[PDB]
Design a protein around this ligand. Structure first.
Ligand code: NA
Length: 155
């Protein structure tokens, strides 16, 4: 019973947080676009990289990790993220695994909710397309909870 409750809580958290992230970006930046170099920019053409205040707040309040990807070609590059490597640096510049179903789902214009590996470890994830004012996909928003964190709750 409690295990199923925890699983449903994780899923509800991710559904809520994935849509909140899109709303947070709209509040922070307004509509986003890609510049010639393939970087996410606001209406003024100002790049968003390093402006992590809202995504950090979302991560803290919903207890998720979170990422905003830029779409370059069919690839998705982490632009804003709360995921960190062992040295404490945010994993900006890493890419979504091109062999995974989350990548295929996003390139097909869909959303992905399910388990996925990120940089070597397993997470429960939500990946949602990010669109510009014309409806064109310019990236993706992601929220996740590590399987390690889920197992810690269950124990
Ligand atoms: Na994979």
């Amino acid at each position: 019973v409690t295990n199923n409750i925890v699983d449903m809580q994780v899923q509800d958290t991710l559904k809520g947080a994935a849509n909140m992230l899109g709303l947070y970006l709209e509040e922070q930046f307004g509509p986003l676009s890609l510049n010639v170099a393939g970087n996410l920019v606001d209406v003024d053409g100002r790049p968003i990289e390093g402006e992590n205040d809202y995504i950090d707040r979302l991560s803290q309040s919903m207890n998720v990790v979170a990422t905003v990807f830029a779409k370059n070609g069919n690839d998705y590059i982490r632009t804003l993220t709360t995921i960190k490597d062992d040295n404490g640096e945010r994993v900006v510049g890493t890419a979504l695994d091109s062999s995974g179903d989350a990548y295929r789902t996003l390139n097909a214009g869909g959303t992905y909710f399910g388990e996925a590996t990120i940089l070597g470890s397993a997470y429960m994830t939500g990946y949602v397309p990010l669109l510009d004012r014309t409806g064109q996909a310019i990236g993706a928003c992601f929220v996740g909870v590590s399987i390690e964190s889920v197992n810690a709750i269950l124990n």
